């Protein structure tokens, strides 16, 4: 007579028991924890609750969805949705204008006194505490070790709880399953990989999809495969002197490297890190205050580590095809061309025509293996700069240019 | 129907077996003797039919989330959850204090830490911690040497006292498991080594072990289990016999290392028989672990001992040194590490090597200098290039420019 | 019996559970990285209190640790040995038996109907307890030693031993 006699029991002892018809499995929620349990589980914890183990479960059929902006329940299209998402005590909480002075010491230390930087931060933590989605900016804290990138972390843990992953690592990463990015607001990893050349490219275009991809794909032990809204914002803390691999045109990561450490500072005490920690309220609280500015939280920033780290990672092949199409001869310069003089491989007439054929965009095969030689500290052939450098860049073209009386070989920069 | 859902709990308990149902396991656990093992329920059927002689079909027992919290009761509650512990301590940890080792375990110790009290009262320090206290630390302690010096006489031992607390003989084989049981609801894991010995596999593992000594919470996957997550209260104990077991870092703060020499067989107090007695006084070793006066600030104290030196210097890139030394203008480490070459060479003449000299000194380095340098440290020539992209730029050292010296424009390096 | 590479590449350990003696054929290939990949492996089998015992379609188990282990090669480096090694005595025997005064056609089948004989005997002998554990630097062993260590730790030890001579 009622197919929701037992859901309503259950409710009545604080427990909100569904059908997933998503998962097949039967969702079972108390205070803020939802665990996904076999039809015998459920059995079992009803038999001691009402005495009697009923053949028929009288619950509801959901969907489990995690959504933050919407109800507990909801309806859409008439397919009832639960919601997974629940605010932790710190996101309800009342604002207030400042933050405390110990976790401003804190912040400031981290962000090297750059009111400029530590504020575009606060906007996008205050974004993710207040209107809970992805960012698509992750933010890397980089440096000497203890100047407090684990001390944030924390911090933010106590503030996020259950929707933030702590100390993920690269052996996270090669596992099969994902837990670490199912219903999460901000995961932060502990190195995204090694500090070598072929563990950053392995790794670099999964985390690039995973901050700014719609949807992700969850794969948990004894569960099926589902695909959920990505609301991930990722905090990338690091020791190396090249976290991660960073394009020039990269839209994504924002780089801070504070070199001073926390016990050498003014302020700091014996207390001061579990005071730090004892601020979180405190912390919550302003940036439920904060006037977010949507514009910014978007909005990366050229650092100058940041600026060391590309021009580390991308190819000197690169850099050399845009000198070229640059017409870069400070770029030459600023690499050394200048050796071919020194070394007599060039007179000085010649030495005038070869820094002329990289600004006129002309360029003699004979001064083009030049170049290349010198730059790259080993000699090139024509094919090997047509192959590797001057087609896969698009530089230019390779033709026969009159150049005094002679017809001669070059290549056209275009 | 049934008017007691916890009749057959009440049964069970009397003849001394405590039987819940894990809503987080989804099986039924079962204690006896501070055992505990989680079966299915046809499992559990079976045990009870033997003890009663009915099997229920309704299995009339308490569900309870299971936890290893040595600091909480045998259960209690947490807002309305209640919650079963997993951790019970073992005899040897339930024992009355004493304020001396047994005499041939201080021996032991003495072999281990070469005689030198102050590592040794800190690593005591650090077990008197563990045994009283019961928490995770973030400091491991790294066992090392040539063989038969008895790293694994004191692994055995407190194996004797810790038991199911304590991982013991985990290898590179546990490791590349895609299961990690050496690390549920443990307080000590030893590991016999931690990766193969070369470059390559110690950097591979570098960052899975950093975060096993420091997570608040790991990621546990048994065979056959839901993979769960629990808090953490692992410390290791590494063993090994290889020249460089881990990579470690200036700045670490989570390895203490342990070089002994000393093979116990070539002792003078060494018999036949000690092996044994080493073994037999485990509940000696106990009693003296849990009379020590814990200094709680010294737990997770690191100390830069010489074979840390030695791992750390092995550990950093020679370019990150070249990159440090042109930073702190150390003309002293360039010669330390055979600049001076150079003029034995005549690559350079006297008058030049006052100037490369003073050029690293004053952090204002010509390139036809800067190359020089480069090549002598790490024998082969580098173009500019190369120098820019491997240890200018990545460490940021300075930046490249023209300088005026006297009337020429040079381009330089200038630090800062 | 005759336990191989094969084996102990799969992740099945029976060849371990519930054993008194372990006879490999081979550790592993003749070449350096083969050894150095199960060295670890077999340094703790031969040592262990526990092992870890992994069976098709049966739970993971630690059990104690009962084994000891025979090794018959072939190659000229069997395995890698370290010099301050507490576990391999190494034998080299150069006299093939058909090529003996005493070796018939019969003699391989006597020999193993003699096992009653040799059991007997074993259960006769007053084991010394002392003796159990100890190893012998054989001049093979000797031989494995300083064809498997490193070069660099032998510069290393010349000098810190001032070994002119070295
Ligand atoms: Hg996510
Ligand atoms: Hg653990
Ligand atoms: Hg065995």
Request: net charge negative.
């Given at each position: 007579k009622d197919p929701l006699w037992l859901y309503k029991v259950l409710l009545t002892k604080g427990i909100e028991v569904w059908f997933d018809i998503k998962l097949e499995k039967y969702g079972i929620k108390r205070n803020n924890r939802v665990d996904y349990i076999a039809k015998s589980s459920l059995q079992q914890i009803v038999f001691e609750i009402i005495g009697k183990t009923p053949k028929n479960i009288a619950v509801p059929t959901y969907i489990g969805a995690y959504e933050?902006?919407?109800?507990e329940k909801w309806e859409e299209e008439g397919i009832k949705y639960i919601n997974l998402f629940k605010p932790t005590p710190l996101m309800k909480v009342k604002p207030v204008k400042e933050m405390p002075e110990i976790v401003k010491n804190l912040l400031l230390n981290l962000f090297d006194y750059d009111a400029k930087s530590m504020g575009l931060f606060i906007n996008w933590l205050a974004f993710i505490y207040?209107?809970?989605?992805?960012?698509?900016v992750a933010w890397i804290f980089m440096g000497?070790?203890?100047?407090?990138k684990g001390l944030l972390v924390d911090l933010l843990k106590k503030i996020f709880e259950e929707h933030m992953s702590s100390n993920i690592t690269d052996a996270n990463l090669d596992s099969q399953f994902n837990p670490y990015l199912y219903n999460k607001l901000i995961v932060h990893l502990?190195?995204?990989?090694?500090?070598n050349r072929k563990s950053r490219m392995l790794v670099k275009n999964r985390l690039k999809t995973w901050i700014?991809?719609?949807t992700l794909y969850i794969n948990r032990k004894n569960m099926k495969e589902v695909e959920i809204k990505n609301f991930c914002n990722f905090i990338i803390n690091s020791?190396?002197?090249?976290?991660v691999d960073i394009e020039?045109?990269?839209?994504?990561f924002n780089v801070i490297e504070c070199?001073?450490?926390?016990?050498?500072?003014?302020?700091?005490?014996?207390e001061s890190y579990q005071e730090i920690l004892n601020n979180a309220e405190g912390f919550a609280k302003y940036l439920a205050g904060i006037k977010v500015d949507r514009s910014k939280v978007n909005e990366v920033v050229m650092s100058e580590k940041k600026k060391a780290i590309v021009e580390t990672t991308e190819s000197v092949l690169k850099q050399i095809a845009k000198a070229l199409t640059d017409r870069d001869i400070e770029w030459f310069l600023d690499n050394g061309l200048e050796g071919v003089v020194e070394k007599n491989i060039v007179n000085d007439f010649q030495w005038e025509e070869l820094q002329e054929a990289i600004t006129t965009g002309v360029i003699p095969n004979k001064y083009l293996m030049i170049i290349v030689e010198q730059i790259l500290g080993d000699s090139k052939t024509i094919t090997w700069i047509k192959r590797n450098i001057i087609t896969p860049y698009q530089v230019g073209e390779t033709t026969v240019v009159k150049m005094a009386g002679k017809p001669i070989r070059a290549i056209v920069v275009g």
């Open positions: 933050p902006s919407k109800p207040q209107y809970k989605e992805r960012t698509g000497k070790q203890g100047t407090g502990n190195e995204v990989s090694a500090d700014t991809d719609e020791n190396e002197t090249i976290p020039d045109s990269d839209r994504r070199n001073n450490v926390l016990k050498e500072q003014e302020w700091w005490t014996t």
